Structure formats: structure tokens, C-alpha cells
């Protein structure tokens, strides 16, 4: 099973200048809980944005060019990325925009954080057809001293 996980600001913005400009520790904790001990697939730009391997996860990087770091696994196509995960129950696709576009048609589950924040981004999450997805979990949180915007955790499953 393939799942996507992403945090979206207003208008489905997910990034700006290869960075995420907000800071929501509660959302990073949610990301860690939902990805630990699973393989994670990311594109090369997201690999450079994160800047180091994510511990406790098999890190698989999509790039058309040879890998430059043997602490992670480099693959050259979507099919190779999936095969490199092996026989696991759940593969987590962690972006970015181009990678989400390619894996969305194959995904059965979306783990989305909706952040109540406006930022002027250059990368968006794909337009997804709402009729195809059932919300199976949602949890709203007001802003607090650690998390400067309100946010909603949602899990959607393909109908
Ligand atoms: N808010 C969130 O949840 C979230 C999550 C992840 C990322 N982001 C943000 O998203 C942005 C990065 O997204 P992005 O769309 O620019 O880039 P991306 O999807 O991370 O990376 C794209 C790169 O991945 C490689 N790639 C993708 N598909 C491939 C394929 N089928 N075969 C081979 N290589 C493939 C290519 O690398 P080569 O050029 O080397 O071939 C391509 O240029 C950043 O701003 C980051 O902060 C946000
Ligand atoms: N909901 C969500 N939030 C995100 O921040 C996010 N980020 C990415 C890609 N970028 C990043 C950037 C940093 C870390 C990171 O530092 N993660 C640590 C934090 C652990 C914690 O804060 O408790 C990790 O071990 O996962 C992960 C992914 C993909 N999907 C996401 N999905
Ligand atoms: Mn092929
Ligand atoms: Mn198999
Ligand atoms: Mn806000």
C-alpha cells in the first residue's frame, strides 16, 4: 500500500524556495509517528531540503542522476522506488510536489495536515478529486505557545 503524507498551507502551498517557512512542532511529531519504521520515498529537491537521512526509516531518493551519498538508497524511476521498499505493509511518500503528482494515482491513503497559514509558495500539493477520498480521521487543534497556527490532522482513504 502506498500513502502520501504532507502538510498544506492555504491554497495547497507546500513549499517556497525549497524550504518550508513555518515551524509547527506538533506536525513534525505527527510526521515522525506516522513514518517511523517505514520506508520513505522523496524527490531529490526534498532530500536537499531535509539535508540528512531520516533516522529509523529506509530513505529512498528519486533522481535521474547517480546518487551522491551511500547512507540512502537512490533510484531512477517510480517502479524502482516501489521495488526498493520490499514487501512492507505501507510505503510513505514524503514529497515534494513532482513526486506527490506521480504517486497520487497509486495511493490508497493520504495523511494531510491543513495549516491555517497564508505563505507565498512556489510548490503545491496536487489537485486531488474530493469524490475519490473518504475522511476517516480528523483532529483540529488551536494554536498554542509552541504552534503558532491552528492545524487539522486528516487521514483520507481512497473510496
Ligand atoms: N509541506 C510538505 O509536506 C512538503 C513535503 C515535501 C516537500 N516539500 C517542499 O516541496 C518542495 C520540493 O518539491 P519539488 O516538486 O520542487 O521537488 P521534489 O518532488 O522533491 O523533487 C523533484 C526531483 O526528484 C527527481 N524525480 C522526481 N520524479 C522522478 C522520476 N520519476 N524519476 C527520476 N527522478 C525523479 C528529479 O531529480 P533530478 O533533477 O535529480 O532527476 C526531480 O527534479 C520544497 O519546497 C520542499 O520544502 C513540502
Ligand atoms: N505533515 C507533514 N509535515 C511535514 O513537515 C512534512 N515534511 C515533509 C518533508 N520535510 C521534512 C522536514 C523535516 C523533517 C524532520 O526533521 N523530521 C523529524 C522530526 C521529529 C520531530 O520533530 O519530533 C523526524 O524524525 O521525522 C521531516 C520532513 C514531508 N511531509 C511532511 N508532512
Ligand atoms: Mn521503467
Ligand atoms: Mn514483492
Ligand atoms: Mn495562521
- Exposure string of 90-129, with b = 16+ CB inside 10 Å and e = fewer, is ebbbbbbbebbebbbeebebbbbbbbebeeebebbbbebe
Q: 133 φ, ψ to 5°?
A: -130, 135
Binding-site residues from annotation for substrate: 5, 27, 52, 57, 113
**Which is the closest atom of ligand 1 to the Cα of 76?**
33
Domain total of the chain: 1
| Non-local CB neighbours of 129 within 8 Å, separated by 6+ positions | none
CA distance 27 to 4: 15
- Spatial contact of 153 and 137, defined as CB atoms under 8 Å apart: yes
Query: What resolution, expressed in A, was reported for this entry?
Result: 1.3
Q: How far is the CA of 28 from the centre of ligand 2 (A)?
A: 5
| Non-local CB neighbours of 107 within 8 Å, separated by 6+ positions | 2, 3, 4, 93, 158
Q: Please state, in angstroms and as integers, the Cα–Cα distance from residue 52 to each residue in 3, 5, 66, 72, following that order.
A: 22, 19, 17, 9
The whole-angstrom distance between residue 64's C-alpha and the CA centroid of its chain comes to: 20
On the question of a cis peptide bond just before residue 96, with omega within 30 degrees of 0, the verdict is yes
Determined by X-ray
Q: How far is the CA of 95 from the centre of ligand 1 (A)?
A: 6
Its domain, for residue 137, covers 1-159
Binding-site residues from annotation: 5, 7, 13-19, 27, 45-46, 52, 57, 63-64, 76, 95-102, 113
Amino acid at each position: 500500500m502506498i500513502s502520501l503524507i504532507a502538510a498544506l498551507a492555504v491554497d495547497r502551498v507546500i513549499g517556497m524556495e525549497n524550504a518550508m517557512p513555518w515551524n509547527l512542532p506538533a506536525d513534525l511529531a505527527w510526521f515522525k509517528r506516522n513514518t517511523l519504521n517505514k520506508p520513505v520515498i522523496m524527490g531529490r529537491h526534498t532530500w536537499e531540503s531535509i539535508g540528512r537521512p531520516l533516522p529509523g526509516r529506509k530513505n529512498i531518493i528519486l533522481s535521474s542522476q547517480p546518487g551522491t551519498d551511500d547512507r540512502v538508497t537512490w533510484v531512477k524511476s517510480v517502479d524502482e522506488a516501489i521495488a526498493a521498499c520490499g514487501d512492507v505493509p505501507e510505503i510513505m511518500v514524503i514529497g515534494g510536489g513532482r513526486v506527490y503528482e506521480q504517486f497520487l494515482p497509486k495511493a490508497q491513503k493520504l495523511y494531510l495536515t491543513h495549516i491555517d497559514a497564508e505563505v507565498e509558495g512556489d510548490t503545491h500539493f496536487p489537485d486531488y478529486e474530493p469524490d475519490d477520498w473518504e475522511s476517516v480521521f480528523s483532529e483540529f487543534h488551536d494554536a498554542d505557545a509552541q504552534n503558532s497556527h491552528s492545524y487539522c490532522f486528516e487521514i483520507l482513504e481512497r473510496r
